Amino acid sequence: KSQIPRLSAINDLHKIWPTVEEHGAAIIESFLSLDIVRRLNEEVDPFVKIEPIPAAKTKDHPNHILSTTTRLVNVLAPISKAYREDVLNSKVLHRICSDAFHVYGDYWVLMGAVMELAPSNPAQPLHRDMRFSHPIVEYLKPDAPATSINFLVALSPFTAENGATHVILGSHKWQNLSNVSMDATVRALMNPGDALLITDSTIHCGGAETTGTETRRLLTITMGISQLTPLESNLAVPRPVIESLTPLAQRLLGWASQRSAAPRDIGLLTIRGNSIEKTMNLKAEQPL
Amino acid sequence: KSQIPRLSAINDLHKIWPTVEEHGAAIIESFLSLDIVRRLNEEVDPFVKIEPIPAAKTKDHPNHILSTTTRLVNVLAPISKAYREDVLNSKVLHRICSDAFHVYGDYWVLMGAVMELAPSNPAQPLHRDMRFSHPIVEYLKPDAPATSINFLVALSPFTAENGATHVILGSHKWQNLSNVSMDATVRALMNPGDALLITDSTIHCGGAETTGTETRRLLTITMGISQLTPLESNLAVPRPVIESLTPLAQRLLGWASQRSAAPRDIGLLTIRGNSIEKTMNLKAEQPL
Ligand SMILES: CN1C(=O)c2ccccc2NC(O)=C1[C@@H](OO)c1ccccc1
Ligand SMILES: CN1C(=O)c2ccccc2NC(O)=C1[C@@H](OO)c1ccccc1
Ligand SMILES: [Br-]
Ligand SMILES: [Br-]
Ligand SMILES: [Cl-]
Numbered sequence: 313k314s315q316i317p318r319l320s321a322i323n324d325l326h327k328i329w330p331t332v333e334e335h336g337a338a339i340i341e342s343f344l345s346l347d348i349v350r351r352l353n354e355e356v357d358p359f360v361k362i363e364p365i366p367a368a369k370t371k372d373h374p375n376h377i378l379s380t381t382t383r384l385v386n387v388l389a390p391i392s393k394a395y396r397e398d399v400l401n402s403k404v405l406h407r408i409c410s411d412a413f414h415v416y417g418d419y420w421v422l423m424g425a426v427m428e429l430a431p432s433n434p435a436q437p438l439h440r441d442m443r444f445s446h447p448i449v450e451y452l453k454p455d456a457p458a459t460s461i462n463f464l465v466a467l468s469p470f471t472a473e474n475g476a477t478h479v480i481l482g483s484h485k486w487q488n489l490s491n492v493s494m495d496a497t498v499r500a501l502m503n504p505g506d507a508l509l510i511t512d513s514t515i516h517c518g519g520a521e522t523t524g525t526e527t528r529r530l531l532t533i534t535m536g537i538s539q540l541t542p543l544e545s546n547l548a549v550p551r552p553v554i555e556s557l558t559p560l561a562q563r564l565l566g567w568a569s570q571r572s573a574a575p576r577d578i579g580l581l582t583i584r585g586n587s588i589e590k591t592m593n594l595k596a597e598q599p600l
Numbered sequence: 601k602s603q604i605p606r607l608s609a610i611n612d613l614h615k616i617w618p619t620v621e622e623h624g625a626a627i628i629e630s631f632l633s634l635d636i637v638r639r640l641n642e643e644v645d646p647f648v649k650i651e652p653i654p655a656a657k658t659k660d661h662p663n664h665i666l667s668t669t670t671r672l673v674n675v676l677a678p679i680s681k682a683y684r685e686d687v688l689n690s691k692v693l694h695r696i697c698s699d700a701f702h703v704y705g706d707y708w709v710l711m712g713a714v715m716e717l718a719p720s721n722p723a724q725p726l727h728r729d730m731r732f733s734h735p736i737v738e739y740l741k742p743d744a745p746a747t748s749i750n751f752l753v754a755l756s757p758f759t760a761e762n763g764a765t766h767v768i769l770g771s772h773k774w775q776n777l778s779n780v781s782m783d784a785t786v787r788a789l790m791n792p793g794d795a796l797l798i799t800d801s802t803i804h805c806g807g808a809e810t811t812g813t814e815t816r817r818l819l820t821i822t823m824g825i826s827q828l829t830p831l832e833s834n835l836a837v838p839r840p841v842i843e844s845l846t847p848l849a850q851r852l853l854g855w856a857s858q859r860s861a862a863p864r865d866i867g868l869l870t871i872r873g874n875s876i877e878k879t880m881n882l883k884a885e886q887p888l
């Protein structure tokens with residue numbers, strides 16, 4: 313079996329999206345620097361510790377899919393300086409997304425989440441993403457360009473032993489799913505800061521944690537066309553935090569109007585022909 | 601040629617969506633009471649008068665499609681008490697939308713706009729809606745249930761002479777568009793408060809104003825699945841106005857989390873497993 317193509321964030325930038333379009337998966341080596349990974353980890357650490365079980369009885373939007381041991385923290389903008397500055401303005405992320413979504417137009421964050429898998433976390437069932445939030449995606453024609461992609465960034469080592477991601481290469485082009493099996497998968501062995509990039513059609517799963525000692529952490533960034541509703545809201549993020557961001561970061565968090573690729577585009581989230589940012593006189597790059 | 605089916609808002613409620621699903625169009629007689637139409641007209645009147653041309657050079661999201669004579673006013677919640685109370689809580693609208701979008705899940709307002717057509721306004725080209733904002737819609741399978749519907753509510757008389765809407769019945773099921781012609785259309789002759797309901801696949805157009813004296817006004821309410829991004833934003837609507845609304849109205853304006861029809865739905869616009877309304881402690885039905 314062919315292994316997941318491994319590409320440089322520095323040199324092979326133009327090759328990344330074409331590789332994912334062909335194979336359905338690619339490893340971006342050093343997608344984030346170890347400095348950014350260190351700062352991300354430090355900032356989200358306490359929020360991961362206080363996070364209840366995914367299907368906690370206190371929640372009015374419980375996640376009944378994720379294992380009880382799993383901890384997911386989303387809406388990272390108010391938590392993490394490293395996320396809202398370094399990650400949301402990543403030159404590599406924005407080149408890949410502009411390559412991926414040019415047919416549709418503007419893209420934004422459907423969800424940026426830190427996931428921590430506790431020791432002995434079982435393997436997820438093989439799946440395509442978006443099926444528990446966007447039923448519309450299943451009604452797209454087979455040859456429809458991907459409407460979302462998922463950056464799975466290692467914040468700790470991904471090994472075969474501690475539950476590194478499984479992917480079926482070429483599975484993003486599959487219509488008949490009779491050959492779906494763990495037998496057909498290859499592993500995303502990754503150092504902290506490496507990213508596994510998949511599409512919403514790539515068949516994949518979290519691996520089994522088999523050591524019983526290792527805690528595995530990842531930053532999952534689902535980037536999707538601005539025509540699809542995000543899984544997470546930034547509506548409650550304080551305006552000072554939003555006004556500290558770049559205009560691009562503001563757009564990614566839904567604090568700006570959006571544009572389609574239609575030649576005479578009439579726009580999304582507009583206010584009587586004017587943008588959110590113009591109407592509300594929204595400042596950008598104002599330090600806290 | 602068969603005329604557009606005409607249905608009672610009072611009696612034929614369960615028949616409305618099935619009729620639109622079959623024929624692609626239906627007239628809902630007295631969708632809004634003349635009292636609601638009167639109050640809507642009074643409240644939006646000044647905002648229509650101050651509205652610049654659709655492609656005004658002052659706008660950063662100009663509409664290059666609509667005729668220079670046309671005036672479109674959206675984000676009606678802050679303008680109109682009648683809209684935010686009576687229209688957004690319409691029992692008829694909510695039954696039709698729940699019938700239409702049950703396969704997908706929650707729905708909301710993609711755009712609520714008052715359109716005023718000046719005397720001698722030319723006929724629009726025959727078209728399907730959403731092609732200038734949501735390119736994704738064109739990539740849906742032919743048998744995909746409609747992801748948006750458009751309520752075209754008469755706020756003044758619709759006559760053949762003053763440019764009443766044209767529709768091609770059955771055109772919502774068309775894949776080959778070689779027979780698209782004004783020869784194949786029938787007219788939506790409507791009294792104020794009557795509504796023409798079409799899908800995002802129904803081929804239709806605004807009619808030609810041929811008198812040179814009559815101004816025609818309509819309330820266009822595009823209702824769409826919560827998985828699709830609205831054309832308009834309510835982000836700048838004052839919180840007091842939002843807190844005066846029903847929870848249902850708040851959801852329709854994107855001031856609440858949303859749910860898909862997926863058996864184990866994980867939700868849209870959520871905040872770490874909690875809703876917008878729970879997180880922000882958003883009050884409902886608090887008078888101004
Ligand atoms: C349920 N669920 C998530 O919560 C999720 C989490 C982070 C990013 C994207 C996500 N979307 C998604 O579709 C799933 C799915 O994982 O990607 C899934 C399927 C089957 C088993 C375990 C997970
Ligand atoms: C451009 N445009 C609008 O602005 C619009 C206005 C109100 C409601 C929905 C709308 N969406 C839409 O798709 C069109 C389209 O009309 O529905 C269209 C096409 C061709 C000619 C004139 C209009
Ligand atoms: Br994983
Ligand atoms: Br019309
Ligand atoms: Cl899990």
Ligand SMILES: [Cl-]
Nearest residue numbers: 666667670806
């Ligand atoms: Cl027009």
Ligand code: NI
Nearest residue numbers: 439440441516
């Ligand atoms: Ni997944």
Ligand code: NI
Nearest residue numbers: 727728729804
């Ligand atoms: Ni139209």
